[PDB]
Amino acid sequence: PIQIGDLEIVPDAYVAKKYGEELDLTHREFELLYHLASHTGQVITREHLLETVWGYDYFGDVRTVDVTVRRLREKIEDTPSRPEYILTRRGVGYYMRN
């Protein structure tokens, strides 16, 4: 389990909580969230997130990652337009705050 600010990720139960309340994430949104929080503040490229979270039938289409991050941000960020949990590293990828 991972606790970051007001966010808690429970891998064994596939649940994410914000202010202690279970969030309504798709399986893919949870796996993205968990994958990001599992690298713990290291930057992950879009291609890397595709290969691990989506898989082979998704090789070229990095835009799926950006679309899913935006949807995840709307669900977990206090201010989705100024995110604090899921962070962008310009031109390389995404990472979870330390």
Interface residue list for Zn ion (CB under 5 A) = 52
Structural contact between residues 54 and 63, judged by C-beta atoms closer than 8 angstroms: no
Question: Three-state SS for 68?
Answer: helix
How many alpha carbons lie under 13 Å from residue 71 in its C-beta half-sphere? 14
Using Cβ positions, the residue closest to Zn ion within the complex turns out to be 52
Token digits of residue 83 = 């995110």
61 or 78, CB closer to Zn ion? Answer: 61
CB of 78 to Zn ion, least distance (A): 26
CB of 52 to Zn ion, least distance (A): 5
CB of 65 to Zn ion, least distance (A): 12
3 or 52, CB closer to Zn ion? Answer: 52
45 or 88, CB closer to Zn ion? Answer: 45
Over its C-alpha atoms, the chain yields an Rg (Å, rounded) of 12
Distance CA 96, CA 44 (A): 9
CB of 67 to Zn ion, least distance (A): 19
